[PDB]
Design a protein around this nucleic acid. Structure first.
Ligand SMILES: Nc1ncnc2c1ncn2[C@@H]1O[C@H](COP(=O)(O)O)[C@@H](O)[C@H]1O
Ligand SMILES: [Zn+2]
Length: 176
DNA sequence: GAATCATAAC
């Protein structure tokens, strides 16, 4: 019932399921940080990245392939670039893969923490995580994630530094 | 005046 269990409730709601198969389910991010923003969750929950082991390798690969399928099935006309990844220190329970388009045009993207959670090392690429599991049997999340969320705003396309969220949103129009 | 930061949510 906690706010932090929200993903489990949503993924069980038939009207919220964008796609589902034997292993995973896709829901829209309720507070999307870009035009296209999905979350991929396994039916068998993973508590956290620390609990990930070599036994999850195939599932993590399946979550990745399902994310890419959803892009094709639902975002083909946009021509947007996408990234797939995990937040190093999530707030919502149940490990979930972010699948998010790189326009970052959304009213829900409101503050520096939002921006840096998709545009610093706090965002762990899905491919990088799969390789970590495939090679070490575990996901290593490096120390100091909270500080990355406070970094000054930097455009992800041209690396220009911006002083505020409104000016960043205005700057992003140059990359239409 | 606008935007951000720090803190709480019973
Ligand atoms: N009930 C919900 N259904 C879908 N997405 C949600 C829900 N509650 C929160 N979210 C999103 O889930 C993500 C949780 O962030 P994080 O824990 O950092 O991976 C955020 O991007 C939220 O916008
Ligand atoms: Zn730029």
């Amino acid at each position: 019932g906690h706010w932090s269990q929200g993903l489990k409730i949503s993924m069980q709601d038939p009207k919220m399921q964008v796609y589902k198969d034997e292993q995973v389910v896709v829901i829209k991010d309720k507070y999307p940080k870009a035009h296209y923003h999905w979350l991929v969750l396994p039916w068998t929950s993973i508590s956290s990245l620390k609990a990930v082991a070599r036994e999850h390798l195939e599932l993590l690969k399946h979550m990745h392939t399902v994310g890419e399928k959803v892009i094709v099935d639902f975002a083909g006309s946009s021509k947007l670039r996408f990234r797939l990844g995990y937040h190093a220190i999530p707030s919502m329970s149940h490990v979930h893969l972010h699948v998010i388009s790189q326009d970052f045009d959304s009213p829900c993207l409101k503050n520096k923490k939002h921006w840096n959670s998709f545009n610093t090392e706090y965002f762990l690429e899905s491919q990088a995580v799969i390789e970590m599991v495939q090679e070490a049997g575990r996901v290593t999340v490096r120390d100091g994630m909270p500080e990355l969320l406070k970094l000054p705003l930097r455009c992800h396309e041209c690396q220009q530094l911006l002083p505020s969220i409104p000016q960043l949103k205005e700057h992003l129009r140059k990359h239409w």
